[PDB]
Design a protein around this ligand. Structure first.
Ligand SMILES: Cc1cc2c3c(c1C)C(C)(C)C[C@@H](CCc1ccccc1)N3c1c(nc(O)[nH]c1=O)N2C[C@H](O)[C@H](O)[C@H](O)COP(=O)(O)O
Ligand SMILES: Cc1cc2c3c(c1C)C(C)(C)C[C@@H](CCc1ccccc1)N3c1c(nc(O)[nH]c1=O)N2C[C@H](O)[C@H](O)[C@H](O)COP(=O)(O)O
Ligand SMILES: [K+]
Ligand SMILES: [K+]
Ligand SMILES: [K+]
Ligand SMILES: [K+]
Ligand SMILES: [Mn+2]
Ligand SMILES: [Mn+2]
Lengths: 500, 500
């Protein structure tokens, strides 16, 4: 089975890529696995596969850390992401995001139901498992629980059956048969949960699948539109119908090659303690526990020699940056284009802790609009910040055509030199804010509202007659023939490879 | 003569450091020397010494590029700066800035007049030189003139004789015997020029010395206080009186080992076309020529085999960043401390194009002040932005004790995660602005006023009870014994030197 359609095959791809380290000696899930993984993430090392995890019983479980983190080399920097999508490992960010947006004007390819799959190789009923006895990792020393769920896919369906949503949301072990987790607006898991609550008849049928097809975990991390079933979108993007099996205890369908599947319910009435968790902005607030959603687990099914993917998230760079940020940015690009705004490219700079998105403007189109900064800033921010795709993003940086938004140094250059503080900015206080950013939920103002800004790093002539500068750099401040001479004579003169 | 007291010795130090490339084949001063130097600056390579410059006549001149730029290695990153000051080449930025601030509470050590020096080895009177015939570089392709003066020291004295100022300010060749250059408020060259203009009796006696003692060019780049003679300050910092010789045509005194000295006058009445010049923010605005100050050159004196230092300035990283930014930041640190503000450290992040300064706060002292963000922001910004040392700086970022302000990635982390846009900021519109930033002089508002901000990246409990988070990183989210195990087993497990 191809790597993008089967997690087990993905793992093998990473091996073949010389991008895996298999650790076959005992590793403690209490902090050690996550510490190793954190180090990998801070240094762009190879992904760790823990094949000998202290506490693994009856095949539950091995761990793969850093499944969507960065490689060291520039030439295959995003290679692990490319492997989730059948792309060459040298694929650019633009090519990855274009792949993820490609199904947005294609017909969905609905999934295919099959009678069984690897995810049925083993099962544990209500009398045979205990979630407190599994080798669930403690990821950060101050976490409020053992976070089993950092890279699985929650599966919930609208009461009417018409929309089945796949998404990632964190969850931790509460007791032998329950999790607690984040279910917050405007996320689709929350939107669906609200529909069940309003109906008031039953708890929400639920499954959580770990080690799902890599192309599915990437759509899981992406804010595709409301009411769109991720399975169909993945099918369209990959050109193939996903093979799903029915759960044993409910009528939901899980990917046939899922490593591990939990089946049960998301309560419409109960909560339990959840968090804190060391998260995407880089922080843990020890003791900041709050009531979260509560899931009941009725049944576990799993592959032989099951592997649990884990994100040891926090400071740069991990899946919370590479996937959350980039995929939001992709959707924001599309949203802007659909609103007739002249945006060519969007990216969340890692340097911003994925709280900014830089928007590359087609300034020939902008010129034709005959507008102003004030007007244009307002229009862009109203589009993006009133939409779910803008939820995580607190600063939009508008930049002209000379800036590569996929290069943080060039975004910082433009921001610092072209956007006058105050005058070239519009503040948005009456928009939904992202509370998990420290300056929001642990800050000076309302946790859930405002704190957003559009920073205009377009120069004034970009609205009127065209760019009126050249950069004072090697590329722009010297003619071609000279530059090439300089390069050709560089090592001859005594000064100091793409792949590395 | 020691490297910090004699430019020729500095050049030799760079050789011995294996931090020089001597180019003995013909190099064109029309763009080629500057292009090579620009490439060095963008890649942190070795400094270039052009010993064979097309157009050099009668010993005028060789060029040394990138005299204060960065080295490739982390361990001696600031080694060229350290060599200007007799510091070890592994010196930290904090150690360099502390050295530059060290003379601020010491008695000045006034200079010593000597009867001659190397700078008198050769001379050209009013009938023997022509500045248009020298090998003055064209530094960027769109510059408005050939910028002879990018790393020399202007020497002007108050009418009353009490203050002799040393500073760097750009200047370009106007004609055979004149330069034009920037003389702008609040710079000391401008302050002195104004005193002469108000007296109205004569043009300002002037000299411009190139290849001066490296400890003197660093004070030249630093905004020490009004009325303080740089020579005395350099003397105190170095522990030795500087040896100066009298000019031939006026009563000013130049460093005895100056490579090249121009003597003449700065006009109190004439101007001429000046600029554009590819500058510290990274931009040139082709055609943006404005009237500048005009200097008349009466006499040139020079060393045998004279060497002209040159800054090929623009995008990161060159002397405009490493010296302008850092030295301003140093003076801002002191200023804050003298105003009873609990600032421990200041640095201008290169990522900001040296338009920001990050201010590290002693939060135990802050707590004792029993204040608020709003109040504290106002107080800091009133100090800094009403002072000359704050002139170039448009954003102040306040950060707590966990942040190393000398590390741009940590400043960006804190800014992006701890400062709520709008609410955690105070805008300053009634302060002097720095017009050379593009968003000022080529922007939407007044070129000379406002555009400044204090961004408070202190969290709320830093004002009250103490930091209430841990970072979700390897350093803070795992106990010591585990971290050390992980490190000790890193290469055993199969994962991947300070000097590299
Ligand atoms: C890739 C990844 C994604 C998330 C999350 C994680 C990872 C690795 C962690 C490791 C589990 C951390 C945590 C970050 C939390 C976060 C909250 C809200 C938005 C973004 C991030 N997490 C989400 C979490 N979302 C929460 O609501 N809830 C979560 O707990 N996300 C992001 C979430 O998958 C994306 O926003 C999707 O667009 C949601 O899908 P949806 O559009 O609602 O169908
Ligand atoms: C290290 C360096 C320093 C400057 C300058 C340059 C270099 C390499 C360039 C290459 C010549 C570029 C140019 C940058 C311009 C600039 C203007 C005003 C402030 C900062 C920079 N330049 C200055 C220029 N200042 C101008 O007024 N005038 C100038 O032309 N500076 C900075 C200037 O030396 C410092 O502000 C000093 O504090 C001035 O000394 P002072 O306190 O007035 O005794
Ligand atoms: K999704
Ligand atoms: K702007
Ligand atoms: K000075
Ligand atoms: K703050
Ligand atoms: Mn969805
Ligand atoms: Mn001065």
């Amino acid at each position: 089975q191809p790597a993008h359609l089967c997690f087990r095959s993905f793992v093998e791809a990473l091996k073949v890529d010389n991008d895996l380290v298999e650790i076959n000696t005992p590793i403690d899930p209490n902090l050690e696995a996550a510490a190793i993984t954190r180090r990998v993430c801070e240094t762009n090392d190879k992904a760790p596969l823990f094949n000998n995890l202290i506490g693994m019983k009856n095949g539950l479980f091995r761990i793969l850390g850093a499944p969507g983190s960065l490689r060291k080399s520039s030439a295959d920097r995003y290679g692990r992401l490319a492997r989730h999508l059948a792309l060459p490992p040298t694929a650019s960010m633009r090519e990855i995001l274009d792949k993820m947006l490609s199904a947005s004007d294609m017909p969905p390819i609905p999934p295919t139901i099959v009678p069984t799959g690897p995810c049925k190789e083993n099962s544990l009923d209500d009398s045979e498992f205990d979630l407190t006895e599994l080798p669930v990792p403690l990821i950060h020393k101050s976490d409020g629980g053992k976070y089993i769920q950092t890279y699985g896919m929650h599966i919930v369906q609208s009461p009417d059956g018409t929309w089945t949503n796949w998404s990632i949301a964190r969850a931790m072990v509460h007791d032998k048969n329950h999790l607690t987790g984040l279910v917050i607006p405007p996320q689709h898991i929350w939107q669906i949960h609200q529909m069940w609550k309003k109906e008031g008849r039953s708890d929400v049928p639920w499954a959580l699948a770990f080690g799902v097809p890599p192309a599915a975990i990437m759509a899981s991390s992406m804010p595709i539109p409301d009411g769109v079933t991720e399975a169909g979108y993945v099918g369209a993007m990959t050109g193939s119908s996903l093979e799903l099996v029915k759960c044993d205890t409910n009528d939901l369908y899980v990917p046939a090659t899922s490593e591990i599947v939990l089946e049960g319910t998301l309560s419409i009435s109960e909560t339990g303690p959840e968090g804190p968790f060391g998260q995407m902005h880089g922080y843990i607030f020890p003791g900041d526990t709050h009531l979260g959603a509560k899931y009941k687990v009725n049944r576990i099914t799993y592959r032989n020699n099951a592997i649990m993917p884990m994100s040891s998230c926090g400071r740069l760079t991990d899946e919370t940056h590479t996937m959350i940020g980039s995929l939001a940015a992709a959707e924001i690009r599309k949203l802007c284009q659909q609103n007739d705004l002249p945006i060519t490219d969007a990216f969340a700079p890692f340097e911003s802790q994925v709280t900014w998105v830089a928007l590359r403007v087609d300034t020939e189109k902008l010129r034709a609009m005959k507008t102003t900064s004030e007007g244009f800033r307002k229009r862009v921010g109203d589009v993006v910040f009133n939409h779910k795709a803008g939820y995580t993003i607190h600063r939009l940086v508008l930049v002209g055509d000379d800036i590569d938004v996929y290069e943080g140094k060039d975004v910082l250059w433009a921001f610092s030199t072209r956007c006058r503080p105050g005058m070239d900015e519009t503040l948005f206080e009456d928009v939904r804010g992202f509370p998990l950013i420290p300056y929001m939920g642990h800050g000076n103002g309302p946790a859930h509202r405002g704190g957003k800004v559009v920073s205009d790093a377009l120069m004034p002539t970009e609205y009127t007659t065209g760019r009126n500068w050249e950069a004072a750099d090697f590329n722009q401040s010297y003619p071609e023939d000279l530059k090439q001479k300089v390069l050709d004579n560089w090592t001859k003169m005594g000064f100091s490879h793409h792949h590395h």
